[PDB]
Structures are given as structure tokens and as C-alpha cells.
Design a protein around this ligand. Structure first.
Ligand SMILES: [Zn+2]
Ligand SMILES: [Zn+2]
Ligand SMILES: [Zn+2]
Ligand SMILES: [Zn+2]
Lengths: 182, 182, 182, 182
């Protein structure tokens, strides 16, 4: 069996199976643009459901990365057609935390939003009924939010790690709090 | 920078980077249950669009596989919540080719449907405005559909390969023509 | 309470509440382009779920109409951007029943596809777990497929009317059968 | 031919044709639970796109309403299957303005959130490439956001109205500014 679901970015500089030292065929993988878990996305949420319910996976890892073309385009003011719609979700976050990112130099900004994004996505994953109910029936399931420093090797980027719904709150809220005061 | 998009199954035994021999950084990856390109899926289309228009990728491979849970689930009679909605598209393909699969022996049906599905998804991909337009303005873009077997490798197929909308027809119809011979 | 869900086309020549003689605020309404019920559409399927489960509605009416801009564009070979993706579903039907429509004069065609579409959509609605489970717990729920002749007043367009899953099969299969032999 | 798009709630007490006094045939209608424009919803965007580009409509109205089940459900703690995914977007809006609503009295919260939601959805609509582009090539298009009350009529609001991306900002931020006064 696989023991982890890996939700990562479609981008190539992020190879899930290679960068970790984990055994081959242990990762059940979903990748989309800027690693998103949108409330109304049947594509991602099907993988999560197949993972949790069918494969009884005990760990979902969400994982962003620095220099993500996703995050950059999300902040660019440029019509690239259909991706612009998908990235508007990321922009909602950008402006949700706009005061933080406002302060930052216009490049720390890119990587900060990258970190914030993962937190927010773990937060979406955690409010999923797929996940929520797995918890409620006593299933062991932990969520995780990391960022792969593409020029280095990754950080358990955040204390954004839930094993229940309340631990989701503690984690996320602390995550956001911390990153809005260094 | 990337040069290929790979749309595969989320399944852990079909990792894109292991199963290809491209240079690292060259693959841009989407995975989802049973490797679908649904006409109205923002997530997958967002990736395709990002590949063709922004990254200017010139090859898309859709990789399906034998002994695939998605296909098995699509044929099974069991409720798996959201997964069911996702596989109703596959169940349509199962119905579209019911006569052919009706002939086949119950065991050989999953592997047939896996092969049909890869043809069908390439047919979807190619009918995309994203793709259609890329061709319509003369950008070079080839679609390839293959099937991987864990105990056996890629089935020497002859199978699915479009570089224009006209060849998409020729390749698609021929693939189905061939599968129908039994 | 309302007692019917009306899934109709966004188009204006089709006013649900007016054209019927039914009491005001009896119709819970969803309208989209060419009245579609796509397996993976959270928008429509949310209305259906709110209808069936929360409002305990006993009747879903799907209802197309003749001279539907949806059906026309679906058959047109013209890029209109984002709607083309949504209409590809209709095109899958067009070519599913292509031999029928092939025979017909190129305008009977428009209205035939309009009728076929409703049948197919009732069929999608009926394979929904939302609907299916309502049936399984003994809830009284009937589906219906009509077409509003925009220049006349409508026909229980088809014997496409399910009160369970097996009555869905009988109805749909007969529907398609009939319309492929006049 | 149409001249207005109406995006309203599916709710039976808020029928678009009754609540307006347009000539018959002029309204083009979308309804869904709690009148959302989600950035990655093919169904709603398909309608908008069809209105702006094909039908060349010059006004879009988003109509919300008081005592709306969608809003009530979004705030409630109950599982309603797919509906939950759909309302997580509304629950985000509830969180986005938590401080403001936190002030408010528990009863007055639904009606506040209904008002915020209409502002938010107009803000989404206006950030659409569909809309943005229409303006960007100088087509005339005005967005309007209103709230309807069954026992009272449309709340004399001053509220939400964009005819350009800059006015979308001005109108949106001002709407929120105003709602915040209490
Ligand atoms: Zn990236
Ligand atoms: Zn598989
Ligand atoms: Zn129509
Ligand atoms: Zn409502």
C-alpha cells in the first residue's frame, strides 16, 4: 500500500518521490498549479477521498515550493486566460494577508505567499467532510504543510499539522499568527 | 524549464519521473484518479493551459495503467462519495463502448476499459480550446496516449497521437477500430 | 414550501413560473446554459441536493427548449472561449447519437438534439447518488424531462420519467430507442 | 434578445422575472444556492461568458436575499454532503468579516452576511477575465449587487455597482466600509 498522499505543485523542480528518502510507491500523488485544495474541486477532492476512504492513508502532505510560477502569476497583473480563474483563489489569500505582504520587500513577498498558501490549503483540506468524518469515526489521519526550498531542501514549513479538527485550528491560527510577526 | 506535460493516474505505482527517462526539471505533472481530462474540470485544464500557453510545452502524454483502482471502482457498484461523481465520466465511456466490452470476457474488461479511457481522454484533451487554438495559430503540440503495466511495461500499442485536430480524429478512431478487433 | 425543482436553460424565452400554471414560489429553480446536469458540477448538484435532502422536494423537472442558443453553439464550429468547454458535454451526446442526427435534415437536427439532451440529462440526474439514495431510503422522488416548444407550449417531451433507478433505465432506453425510429 | 443577466438564489421566493419589471425575453437567468460567483465554477462562469461575449449583455445583477437557506446552512454546523463544499466559500466570507459579524447580535448576523455576500460575489464577478476583458476592450458593462427581502422589498442600499475595474474597487470597499458602521 501507499502510506502518504502527496498534494504538490505540477512543477518539475518539485519531484515528490525523489526529494524525500521514502520507499518507492509509498506516495499516492496529486499535483495541480500551486498545490491547491479548492472546496469545490472534484479533481483534487477525489484523490483525497480515494486516499482517505479507499486506501486508508494515514497522512496527507500538502507541499508548496519557492519560485513557484503559480504564486508569481497569481500576483502578476496579466491575463493568461483560464489559469487566472484558478489563481484568483491564491489572490484572495494574497489580499486576505495583504497587510503582512504589504510590509515585505517585493520578493520576500513571493516566498511568504508561498508559505501562507500552504497553511491556507491545509486549512481547506482540514474543513473537508472527507477528512472531518474520517476523524470522527476514529480513523488516524494527519495533515501536513511543507514548503520545498527549491534552491536547498525543505522545511516543515509551518506548525500547520492537524490530527483532528481542533488541532487544525490551533495549528493554522498559530501558523498565520507567527508569519505575521517576525 | 519543462518540455513535457504528463497527465497520469495518482496511483503510487505509476510515478511519472521513474517511468520516463527525461532530464530532471523537464516533466510537468498532473495526476488524478484514472487520469481524466473532463471538459469542465478547472484543475486539469488549468494545468494544460499553463503548459501550452505559459510554459510553451510541445508534448502532452496521458498515461493510463492496468489494474487501476479508478477503473475498477467505475465498474463496481459501490458508493464512495465524491469519487462516484468523478467516475461517472468513466462509466459513460464504459457505456459508449458497451457492445465491444460486452463481447469481452469479464476479467479482460478492466484492461480493455483502461485502454479505451486513455484514447478517450486524449480525444477530450484534443478538443480543448487550449489545444485547438495552439494548433490553430500554428504552435507545435503533439498529444500522446499510452498505457503502462506494472508487470510488463508500456503496451507496444501504435495507439494515440495527435499533432492537429484532423490527426486527432484519425488516431482516435483508428485506436477504437483496433481495440474492437477481437 | 416549494414542491418542484426546475432545472431549465438560462435563456429568457423559457420562464418557468409563467409558462406553467403552477402556484407562485412552488418552483425551486436552477438555470444554466442548455439545462445541463454534469456529473462533476457542484453548482447544479448543490441545488439538487438542497432540493432533495433539505427541502424534501418530490419532483425534479429538467426542461429544455427549442431554438436553444446552447444547442446551436454546441453544434457550431466556433470558438466562443469558455462556453465551448461546457458545451463539449452536449457535443459528446451529438456524436453519441450521430447516426440519428446524421440522417435528419440540418435543422430537425437542432430540435432533435434538444430532445435527446433532456433525456441524457435526466439520465445523469438519475445516476446521481443524491437522487439514488433518496430513492433507497424510500423518499418519493420523481424526475421528468420536458421540452418547451418556444413557438408553441411544451410537450412531456419523452417518456423520460423515473421514480426509481430501474424506471430510469426503462424510460431512458425507450426514450432513445423511440427517437432513433419514427 | 436579452439585455440583463440575473444571478440569483435558487430560492422559490426570489423569482427573477417577478421581482423585476423588464420586458419578457430580456432576462437571462442563473440561480444557484446563495447566489455565488465562485472563481472556478464552470457553470456560473459559462453563463456570464455567454452573456457578455455572445449575447453582448451590458448589465449583470447579482440578487441576494434575507432569510436565505444557503446563508443559514453556511453558518450552521450540519453535514449536507455536496452542499457543504459549496458553502465553504460562503463560510470563508463569514471568516473574512468575522470581526464585524463578531460585533453583531446573533440574530442580525444572517442578514449582515447576506449583504456582505452580494458585495463579495460582485467582487468576484468583476475580477473575472470575462468581465475584465469586456471592459479592457471598451465594451459597456455594469455590475449591480442588490439584496431582496420578502417582507420589505429591495433594501434601499447605495450598495454595489461597477462599470470598470477601478469602480469595482471603489464600490466594493465602500460597501464594506458602510456595512462596518454599527
Ligand atoms: Zn509551482
Ligand atoms: Zn489508477
Ligand atoms: Zn437555451
Ligand atoms: Zn437563498
Amino acid at each position: 500500500t501507499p502510506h502518504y498522499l502527496w498534494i504538490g505543485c505540477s512543477n518539475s523542480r518539485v519531484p515528490a518521490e525523489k526529494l524525500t528518502n521514502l520507499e518507492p510507491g509509498e506516495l499516492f500523488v496529486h499535483r495541480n498549479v500551486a498545490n491547491q485544495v479548492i472546496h469545490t474541486d472534484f479533481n483534487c477532492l477525489s484523490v483525497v477521498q480515494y486516499a482517505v476512504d479507499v486506501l486508508k492513508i494515514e497522512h496527507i502532505i500538502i507541499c508548496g515550493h519557492t519560485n513557484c510560477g503559480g504564486i508569481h502569476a497569481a500576483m502578476a497583473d496579466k491575463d493568461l486566460g483560464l489559469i487566472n480563474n484558478w489563481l484568483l483563489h491564491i489572490r484572495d489569500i494574497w489580499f486576505k494577508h495583504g497587510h503582512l505582504l504589504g510590509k515585505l520587500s517585493p520578493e520576500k513577498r513571493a516566498d511568504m505567499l508561498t508559505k501562507i498558501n500552504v497553511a491556507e490549503q491545509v486549512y481547506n483540506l482540514g474543513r473537508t467532510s472527507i477528512v472531518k468524518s474520517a476523524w470522527e469515526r476514529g480513523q488516524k489521519l494527519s495533515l501536513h504543510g511543507w514548503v520545498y526550498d527549491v534552491n536547498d531542501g525543505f522545511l516543515v514549513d509551518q506548525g500547520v499539522m492537524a490530527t483532528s479538527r481542533e488541532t487544525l485550528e490551533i495549528s493554522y491560527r498559530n501558523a498565520i499568527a507567527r508569519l505575521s510577526i517576525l
